[PDB]
Structures are given as C-alpha cells and as structure tokens.
Design an enzyme around this catalytic site. Sequence first.
Site, PDB file in Angstrom:
ATOM      1  N   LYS A  41      18.710  16.279  13.380  1.00 50.48           N
ATOM      2  CA  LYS A  41      18.084  15.803  12.151  1.00 50.48           C
ATOM      3  C   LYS A  41      17.092  16.876  11.728  1.00 50.48           C
ATOM      4  CE  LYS A  41      15.312  12.009  10.224  1.00 50.48           C
ATOM      5  NZ  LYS A  41      14.866  10.634  10.446  1.00 50.48           N
ATOM      6  N   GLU A  99      15.188  15.825  16.242  1.00 46.65           N
ATOM      7  CA  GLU A  99      14.579  16.107  14.946  1.00 46.65           C
ATOM      8  C   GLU A  99      13.444  17.122  14.963  1.00 46.65           C
ATOM      9  OE1 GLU A  99      12.701  12.738  13.018  1.00 46.65           O
ATOM     10  OE2 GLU A  99      12.335  13.853  11.173  1.00 46.65           O
ATOM     11  N   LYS A 137      15.506   8.452  18.430  1.00 46.77           N
ATOM     12  CA  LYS A 137      15.028   9.521  17.567  1.00 46.77           C
ATOM     13  C   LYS A 137      13.670   9.977  18.085  1.00 46.77           C
ATOM     14  CE  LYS A 137      12.441   9.796  14.442  1.00 46.77           C
ATOM     15  NZ  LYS A 137      11.456   9.824  13.317  1.00 46.77           N
ATOM     16  N   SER A 150      19.972  10.915   7.156  1.00 41.89           N
ATOM     17  CA  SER A 150      19.159  10.106   8.044  1.00 41.89           C
ATOM     18  C   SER A 150      17.943  10.027   7.148  1.00 41.89           C
ATOM     19  CB  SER A 150      18.804  10.827   9.340  1.00 41.89           C
ATOM     20  OG  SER A 150      17.936  10.005  10.108  1.00 41.89           O
ATOM     21  N   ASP A 152      12.313   3.475  10.771  1.00 39.65           N
ATOM     22  CA  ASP A 152      11.479   3.494  11.961  1.00 39.65           C
ATOM     23  C   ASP A 152       9.997   3.804  11.766  1.00 39.65           C
ATOM     24  OD1 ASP A 152      12.611   6.167  11.381  1.00 39.65           O
ATOM     25  OD2 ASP A 152      11.527   6.782  13.188  1.00 39.65           O
ATOM     26  N   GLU A 199      11.574  18.857  12.577  1.00 36.46           N
ATOM     27  CA  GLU A 199      11.255  18.974  11.158  1.00 36.46           C
ATOM     28  C   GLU A 199      10.258  20.056  10.788  1.00 36.46           C
ATOM     29  OE1 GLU A 199       9.719  15.444   9.089  1.00 36.46           O
ATOM     30  OE2 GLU A 199       9.725  16.567   7.195  1.00 36.46           O
ATOM     31  N   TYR A 215      22.192  35.689   1.610  1.00 36.40           N
ATOM     32  CA  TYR A 215      21.523  34.744   2.498  1.00 36.40           C
ATOM     33  C   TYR A 215      21.494  35.269   3.927  1.00 36.40           C
ATOM     34  CZ  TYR A 215      21.901  31.635  -1.480  1.00 36.40           C
ATOM     35  OH  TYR A 215      21.774  31.107  -2.745  1.00 36.40           O
TER      36      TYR A 215
END
Lengths: 360, 350, 350, 353
Positions: free
Chosen positions: B229, B187, B146, B300, B33, B189, B350
Amino acid sequence: PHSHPALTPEQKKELSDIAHRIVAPGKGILAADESTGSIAKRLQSIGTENTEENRRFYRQLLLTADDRVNPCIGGVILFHETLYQKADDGRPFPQVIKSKGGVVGIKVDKGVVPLAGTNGETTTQGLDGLSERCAQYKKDGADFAKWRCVLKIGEHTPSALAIMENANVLARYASICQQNGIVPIVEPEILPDGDHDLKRCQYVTEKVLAAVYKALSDHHIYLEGTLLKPNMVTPGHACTQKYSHEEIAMATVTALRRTVPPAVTGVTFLSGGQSEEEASINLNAINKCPLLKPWALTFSYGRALQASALKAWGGKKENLKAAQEEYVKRALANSLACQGKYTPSGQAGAAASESLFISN
Amino acid sequence: PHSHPALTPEQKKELSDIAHRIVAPGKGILAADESTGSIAKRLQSIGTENTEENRRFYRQLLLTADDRVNPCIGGVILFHETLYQKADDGRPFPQVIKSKGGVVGIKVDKGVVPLAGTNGETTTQGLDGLSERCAQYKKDGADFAKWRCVLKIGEHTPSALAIMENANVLARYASICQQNGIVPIVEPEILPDGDHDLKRCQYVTEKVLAAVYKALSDHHIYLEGTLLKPNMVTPGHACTQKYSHEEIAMATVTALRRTVPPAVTGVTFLSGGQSEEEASINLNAINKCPLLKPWALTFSYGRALQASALKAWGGKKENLKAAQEEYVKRALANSLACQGKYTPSSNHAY
Amino acid sequence: PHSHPALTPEQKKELSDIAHRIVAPGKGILAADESTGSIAKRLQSIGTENTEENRRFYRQLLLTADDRVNPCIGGVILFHETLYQKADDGRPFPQVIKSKGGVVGIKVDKGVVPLAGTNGETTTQGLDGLSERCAQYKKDGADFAKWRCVLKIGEHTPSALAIMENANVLARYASICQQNGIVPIVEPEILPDGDHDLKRCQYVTEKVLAAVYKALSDHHIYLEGTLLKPNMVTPGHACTQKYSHEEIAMATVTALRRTVPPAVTGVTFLSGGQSEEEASINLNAINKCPLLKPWALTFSYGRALQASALKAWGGKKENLKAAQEEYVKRALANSLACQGKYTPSSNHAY
Amino acid sequence: PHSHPALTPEQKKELSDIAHRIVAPGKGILAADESTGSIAKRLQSIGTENTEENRRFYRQLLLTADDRVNPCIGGVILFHETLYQKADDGRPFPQVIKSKGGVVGIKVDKGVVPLAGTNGETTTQGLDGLSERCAQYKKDGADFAKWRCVLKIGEHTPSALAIMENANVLARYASICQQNGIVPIVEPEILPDGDHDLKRCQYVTEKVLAAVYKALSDHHIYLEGTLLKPNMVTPGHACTQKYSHEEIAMATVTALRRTVPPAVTGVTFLSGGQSEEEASINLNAINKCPLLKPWALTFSYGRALQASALKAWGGKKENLKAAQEEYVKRALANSLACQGKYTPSGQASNHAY
C-alpha cells in the site's frame, strides 16, 4: 533523498533500445568471450594448440555461420582479442556480427580473486580504468558488456560478505558501463557445484538476487538499460534427488519473480555446465512455466552453444561447414526454446547429451 | 546460506489465496481503520460528537451499503474497536463484511513515534505482543492486517536512518503476521507534503520501495502472501508545476516496475489526501498506463471512499440512505478505475 | 550528511554523569531484575513459594545489606514490580538503593520473541510506549535501564538477520532511553551454550559488537551516555578443549578492543551461568590483562552475586543476615575484581 | 557465523610490529607519495621543470636529510617511481630510508573516479592486480601502503552511497594488503572545502569513520595491523566562525574516541591544506587534549613537511642544505607535537561536542 540524474533521457533511451534489441523475441546471446586461458582448455580438448590464429579461426567459424542464425542471435559476447580480429574477408568481427543483425558485446571483468577470511570465496576485479575502456569499446562497435561474479553453495557459503561484495562490484561495473552508453549484463553466477538440492539453490539464488538489485538501486542503476545473466535454479551437480524440467522451471521462475523488478529488460540464462540439450529443454520449460514473467527469458550460452561445434571442428579447416552446422542447430533450438516452442527430437548428436560441467 | 522454512506449503497457500481474493479483478479495499483520535476530525468536521455509538453507526452505514458494492470491495480494513462491534440486527461486523464477499482486515500498528536525531522523522510502533494479537484477530475473523509507516520528503528527508528503520519494522510486522495466517499489507507512505516535483517523489518512492523489499527479503517474507500500500507518485501539494494524470500514472508505474517484485500479489494505493474524483481518475490512468504491470493495481482508500458519504450523513441517522449512496458511487467508480474503465463526467523521461 | 542534535549539551552531561557514577572505580552493578517467571525458578530451586511478599523479602534482603556493599555497588537493576515495592521500614526500594550511594536501574524489555525463518533465533520486544514508560521511570527514581538481546552460537547462528535485527532494536531502545534522561545499558548477550571453542566465541563476539556499534551510530546514540553489558569471551559450556582464566581474559579484552569505541563509558559483564567464584576470577583476569583498556571493565552480575545468598536464605526469615553475608562477600570479591585486586584468597594468537 | 582465519599468528605479528614501528613514540610519517601529475603542481610553484631527475633530486633532498630526522620519521610514503630510484651514491631510496630507521611505504591507489548519480562525489580505484603489486612491493622493500578516498561536505554530501562505497573499497584494499605482509594505512579524507562549521565536520567525520570500521569488520581486517589517516576535525575553509586549537583538538579527539577501536595501532593525521605551523600546533593540541586516547596520535604530513623545503630549494642544487634545513625543522616540530611537547620555543565542557 535528492536526485542527481546519472543519465539523461537520451542516454536512457539508447541503453533501453540496445537492451531490447539483444533479447528481442526469439533472440538470444552467443557467449564466445572465453579468455586466452579459458578457450585454451576448450581447444585442448580437441588436440588443437592455443594460438591466436586457431582462436581467430574458431571465432570466425561461429560468427560467420549462415543466415539461419540471424533471427536466433540478438547479441554476441566477445573477449578483448576477438573484438579486434578480422574475418578472412578482412571484415572486423564486430562488423561481421552487426551485418547479421547482432549487437556486439565485450567482456570487461578481469577474473575472480580470493576474498581473505572466507572459505574459498571470491569477488571479481576489473574496475580500474573501466570507464576509458568502455568509451573505447563503444567507439569500436560494442554496445553491451558482461562482468562475471562467482558464488558457490556450501556449508558456510555464500557468506554475507561474499554476497554483499559481489553485489557491490557488479553495481560499480554497471554504473560505469551506463555512463559510456554500454548496456551492462549483470552476471551473479551461483555455481551448480555440490550435492545441494533444488530448494537450496532456489533459496540462495533468491538471497543473491535480492542483494544484487538492492546494490543496483543504491548505485542508481537504470534497470531498463541492463540485462541479468543468472544461473537457472537446479539441484547441485552431485545431488541424488531427481527433478523434472518442469520443477527446475518452476523454481527458476519463482526465484526470479521474487527478486527481479519488472523494469529489468531481460534475463539471459547461463548454461553453467548443462548439456546443449539440457540447456535448451530447461529454457523451453522456463518459458512454458504457468506463471507471469514480466521480462524476456532467453539465453546467453557459451558451452551450450559450442559443444558440438568444437567437436565437429576438431581444429581442422576441412570441418568448417560441419562445425557451423552443429552451432546453427543449437542456435535454432534455443531460439525456439526462448519462445517455449522447442520440442526435442533425436539428433544434435550425443555430444549435445553430454554434461559440460566443469568443477571449480 | 541455509534455509530454515518460515512457512509450510499449506501456510503459503493460505496467505497467497487470501491476498489474491482481496485484489481480485475489479476489487479494492475500503480502509475504515481510523482510530478514535483519527476519526475525531472527521466527525468534528460535521459537528458529530466522537462517541462509540456514532462510530459504530458510521461504520455500520458503510459496511451495510447495498449489494452494489460487493463486487467492488475485496477487503475492509477495520480498527480494533470496530472488529468487535455488531450491527443493529446483532450481526458482528466481520460477519457483515464476509456475507458481502469481502475479506476482513485489521490495522495493527500503534501509531508513529519520533526518531531522535532526525528532522522530525518517525518510525512506527506496535510489535509488542503482536503475535498474540494476530492469533486472536485471526480467530475472530480477520485474514489480513495493515501497518502504516510515514516518511516525508524534505531538504534532508527521508534520511538513511528513517528509510532503513521503517523498512525494518515493516518486515518484522510482516513476518509476525505471516506466522499467524494473516496477510500483511505493507504500507510505506511517503507524504505528499512539500513543494517537491514529480521527479523528486518518483526518486524517493523508488529508493524507499527498494529498501522495503530488501528488508522483506532479509526477514524471509513470503511476497506472494503480501500486499503493498504505497503512495501514488505525485508532485508535492505545494508544487507550483502542474502535471497530467497520465504523467503521474507514468511515474507511479515506472517506480513500481523498478522496485516491486512480480511475486507481490497486489498494490493497493492509499489516496493520501487526494479528492475522491482525483484518486479515481489517477487509479484509472495508472491501469491504462502503456507499460507492463505484473501485479494488480487497485485501491485501499480511506478518505477517497468516505468523503462524500461522511458529509451526506452529517451525523444524522435520517441521512443513512443518502450517505450510503455516496459511498456506493465511489466504490463503483474505483472498481471501474482499477480496471481502467472509469470516466468521471514507454517514456525514458522517467 | 546533516546533523539534527538528538541531545543538548545539558542532556549529554546528565547521561554521561550517570553512566560514570555507575561504573566509578571499584563499583559494579547488582542485577536483580528477574521477572516474575524468572525469579520463580530461583525461588523454586530453594523450595520457596513465588509470592509477591517472598519476592519483596528476597529483594529487600539484597538491597538492605550492610554498608560494606556501598563502595561495591554503583548500580542496581530492578524489575518493574520491585521498583514500586517498599522495605519493612516503609522506604521504597529506589530510596533504599539511593541512600546507599547506588544509582537505580530498571529493566524495560519485554522478553525475547522468535524470528521466523531462523534456526530458533530471537529478537527482543518492548519498544511500544517505551518513551512514556521511561519518562515515568525517571520520575520514580530510575536513571538507567537495561534491555537484553539473546544470540546463540550454533551451526548456522548467529545469522546475519539475527545480528542485524538485535543490533537494530538495541539502538532503538537506547535512542528512546536517552531522550528521557535514562542511561541505556546495551546487552547483546551471546549465550555460552554449545561445544564451540574460545576462538569461535571471540569471533562471534567481535562480529556482534561491530554490528551493535554501527547500529548505535546509525541511530545517533551518545556512547558516553551508555554502558555495554556483553558476555565475556569464553569457550562454550560443553567445549572439550579447556582454557585458563588468562586466555579467557585475553580473548575478552581483545574482542572489546577491536569493537568498543573508547567513548563508551563502561563495560559491565554479565556472569552468564558462571559460578560466583569463576565470574570473579575472570573479571579479575580481565582487569589484569596486559592490554590497554580505555573503559571501565566491571560487573553487572545477577546469579554471580545471588547464588549463595539465595541458598543461605532458603525462604526462611531467620536466615536473613546469613544470606546477606553471602551477598556482601560476593560484592566485596567483585569490587576487588573490577580493579584487578582480587585473589581467591603471543597475543597475536587471538 | 564461522571463522575462516585470514591471517596466521605469524602474519598478524609481522603486521602489528610494522604498524607499531611506524608510529612509535615521537615518530610520524613523511608523505612524499605525490604522483607525477600531483608533484607537477608543486614543482610549478617554484618554477621548476617536472622531469624525473628533478623529482629524484627533490625526493633525495628529503630522504637524505641529516640524522636529526631519524627519531622523527617512523615511515616514509613513496610514489611508485621513487621506490625504484637511487640516491647519488647508488643506494636505492628504500635502503636510504631503512638505514635512517624509517619503514618504507608505498601509495597504491590509482586515483579517484566519479560516482554516477551523485553530486560530484567520487570513489577510488586501484584494486586490479593489487595483490601482485603488493607482493612485488613487499619484496622490493615496502612494509606499508596508502590508499586515499576523498569525501566532501556539502548540501547532499557525503551521500549514503559515497560513504558506503568508499568504506567498502578501503576494506578491500586493506584486506589485499594484509595478505601480502603490508600494513594498510586507511585514508578516508573528508575535504575541508566549504563554509560548514566545526560541529558539522565532527558529525560527518564520526559517521564516515563508523562506516569505515564496520566495513573493515565485514572484510575481516586485522585492526592491530592497520593505521588510520583521517582529516582532523576543523571548520570548513570558508567558515566565518573562528575556533581555537583547543576546540579543534577536542572535536577531533571526540570524533575518534566515538568511532576508532582501541585495537587500531595509530592515527596519522593528514595536514590537508593547513600551513606547516598550523598542522603542528593542532597536532600538539590534539595530543594535549584532556581525554583518554588509546592510539598513537601522530602525523602523516605531505605539504606540512615540504612547503618551506620546496620553496627554499627553488629547483637549485645550490640551495640543497637550505631546503633540507626547512624539512628537518618541521620534522622536529611535529615529532614534538605527536608527543604534546611542541612549543613555539623550539624543542624544549566536552559535553558540547
């Protein structure tokens, strides 16, 4: 945006290990943390006056049941008083509980208080000096704690304020607990009071849990070192529409899957007024629900584990064995239930078929 | 405290079904995309003029790769332009994708915009007329969308404002998509830029995702009808400390386990600058991580699926088969990766 | 906990100066920003074809009224189309407005959209490319903008989501405007629709405004460089209980005093369906309310300044002066009202 | 979206009247609510044993100062112990304060506690049994209360959590107080510790106060029945850059104008480490600031009213009059300062912010 570790790896391990032990497969929690004014109501329903001795004896009756409960009970929640009481053989109750493979828990909240400007809504108090109290409870044998917040489904409730405030105080309590090596059981109970249906309860439960976990995140809570004690998703106690156990299970598990992070070690359902048999059957259906459940789904029953026991006891010492037998039967039933291996039969008396609902 | 059903049971089934098809076992997403300005560098790095034809040809090259990719590609994200282009044989690209077993996706955001009063942080635009656009895209073949929000780890970032605002716009986007039968890929990010370590990324990822899901809940988003995502949890690009794939996998899975509700149908990681091999090796490590993962953990990938193919092509039709071969190999690699069966040649810490 | 100045002292000065000019003593705003579809009803109510020319003429009619309105009008909000039209003398409307001592405003929102999962609630769109649009509008004569959010009092509304989302989008819009030298008029309109009483409106208004300012704070909005266009606090349009202008004024001023920081330069009330006289009487009572008011309390009237003018016009060019006369009368009436000098000739209970 | 009135018109009136009496023109608050541990530090600076009697004697010293302080003191904040102590003549201290025209206040928080996961940040405890405590205090003479939250300016502080949590507890505290006829003084103190400059403090003060009032709104707090006790906006103690009192005032007033609703009856500044004269000059400047201020801007000083008195006393009964004189002088100065009439004489572009 900058991390300031609330817990060390060693501390996380202790909390995580503790939490897993409590909800180990087939195991559940016996909630015997009724306050003096709360248990008094119970003893009153059996012509037994509320005295320290009667309470001590009653708790001893449950805590000293035969070894058949050992595999069923991962933990026992006690009230302050009981934590410092001893069995007839001189052993402190916490020692009694541990000797039977159980983890000792202590209720630390100080009850609900009204939220001004709301329609009869409340928040819960008990944070003052909680740190010192937890350090002391830890030294005295307790490894986990419980704090109860209460919400109600109504026309304008639960309100945005009630949800936010209750979620925040639970986070504060959980934070203080973890700083003292105590696993906090987060209990955001949404009462069954009302004539709302199943989907209404599911909706509210999803919103409440979403708020609870956002607050726990804001307060840097180590989820792996916690347990959740929520209401099962069911229609209101006065709802006309009828639902099957499979439906209650589907609504409950769906609500949890949409809000509870996989990191949460386990979910220990409150029975909230359900009959002993109803609580077991629903828990069983929940564990059989055909949906992925990343956390232990067990019990943390108070009334659903004591109904028959209280009745059988009647406050008379001679009914010791009889009372313990009823308790053991429910512990065994629920142990199988949290494994999806429970199949009702025909006993447990009619006392296990009666609703233990108590309007608020 | 009262429910006003955003979706009917039928609408829910449609969204859920689409979501599950995209991330079915062994399947991932080809993210092709890139906008005109975005695909610009890509073509520039190979001396290929950025014309509509070359873009169509490049996209055709990927979308028409041999059937070996079919079981690897559950979905393909397209840029508007591409959604309405046709292959040489006249077949609309959406048709090409669908005939190969993949679901068609459409990127719908309109890029990032600066957030005033912040240290170079941004939010993302694209909500205006989005409902109408989604209805049109649905009618034209797309079943998922998206939307990309970008956050950065710095001394004062991501800030409370950036986290809150990006989570909120993602929720609005998701809501609009679901009203039109489109599965929204959320998404958020977090860039890998900086010298921060693995713990820092894990911490920020956990806070961002927690914010993202609270916002999705506030906006009544049907999680089963969504996909996430996110960035994998990794040290910053300039971080001097080094980690193993098992460690980034542990941090990644731990962060997701602490924030992503089980109801979320699947997680499709972005490669965000990682090399093709690194992205595959990390995804593989993530799927073999000894922790319970209640959602599909796949890919993805944009760059991580096109790097070698783009280079092999060089903008020369002559290199068609060579280019496609590189893409197929990465599609195959990642398909195995999301199954934890790829080979290139709990912890309370963690 | 760290600051990154969204604006320089020079930018702040520019915005503050603009906001103060608009609400200078005795001045108000003429809201003539009706979209094509909105003005369509107005023109239709008087049997006039909704053509570009008729819209141009009507707007000319209002903007070119005699100088008696000059001291009454501190600002004029226009719709895109009108910002680019000219009067019969060839002068663009922005120049006409400015030559009369008025500041030019531009409505920049793109209408309301439904919030899924709510009982008919909405948020507002229009952020996409807003920055470029503002930069252009600034160059073309506008110094302030307007964005309208709509909330409704009902059984389960305004909901938490509706309040939070509308407050947030207003903050985004305000932020973008200030980056481009445009003073944003924040309009969180709570409709008068319903049979709710005065107390309920005051309650909802207090909660909505507290949300608006918290959002404005989170987005680092410079309040001195903004204006607030709220609904006055009044009983629902269908409330059986009746109240006096003094009670409406007390409920309104009390709500604002409990939520609007003193730094906000001015409050420009929308008329929201009130008649021309009523809107002026309430504005007068608001300014006569015996409570301290740290901000200008004036008007931003659309219908309350155009009702009679539109009727006197009737789409006939020969009724120009007659129609303008009616507008001038309402401008004069409201200019006195925002000063508490207009005559149609236990505060703890709030 | 539905209102469930937390207070009746009668309750609101009582709270509003109380709040207004405390900050009436020319009046401020004497903050003498130091706890045992806190006052221990003060008594140690003058080589005086920290005994209940010495504390009683000290509090008596301030409370029974001559009538010159009457028009200067609208309220006095007491620690629990003091509220139940009596002057030599047998009069309960609350009665002493009331007879001099002052409203009686009581500190009700139980100190700060660490917020896990933060860089040394805290929240404040004391809500447990607070309603019962307020009902009792009300009955025993107190009409207002004080709760102190502490925030710090640093590289990562005040964090989003610290701000949110402290704002929330303050709201809960305020809510409980109003249900019992007690006017809550909301104190979100941002410490002056650090090398940050004036604009950094103004920024943080603005964000903190915005959070505080949103929380008060969410908890349905009646603002007219509350007071605010914030830090003035000043550079950090270790800031190398110097600022004038005019700039301190501009920054302080600007921060408040941008966050404090005009419904708030009054702002009673804490002196937070400033010298007696410094606190008075800054307060005067704040009141002379050329900006519209819709709320009373006065004082709620502890150290800034007791520094000299405590020293003049030295723990010796002999110095009683001398110590009371020092207190009276500061009371007079600040009374003039909250009116912008203070002068060393005696008793006779804002866009860059």
